[PDB]
Amino acid sequence: SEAQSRIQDADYATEVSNMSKAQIIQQAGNSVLAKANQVPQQVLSLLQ
Amino acid sequence: SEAQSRIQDADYATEVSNMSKAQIIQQAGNSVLAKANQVPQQVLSLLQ
């Protein structure tokens, strides 16, 4: 049982860390996508 | 008869000594088991 525990079970100390990292990266990516979305509109002011 | 009694009868002092030792060891083991049972409770506060 001790031997099987090393292969099956997860490491809860590391998984919450990885989850927080992924969530932070997702929020950063959503913000960057939102801010990089509205830069063809300089053409709108540029042509008028 | 006195020869046979050396092989059949027990020694009460040694027996009560071993009984007390075993009872102390069992109580210690139950305490240690109950103490090592809430080891995986830290991951619960870790993930929240």
Curated annotation (Swiss-Prot), chains A, B:
Localisation: Secreted; Bacterial flagellum
Where is the signal peptide, in residue numbers?
A: none
Family the UniProt entry places it in: Belongs to the bacterial flagellin family.
What fragment of the whole protein does this chain represent?
500 to 547 of 548
Q: What does this protein do?
A: Flagellin is the subunit protein which polymerizes to form the filaments of bacterial flagella.
Sections of the chain in a coiled coil: none
| Name of the protein | Flagellin
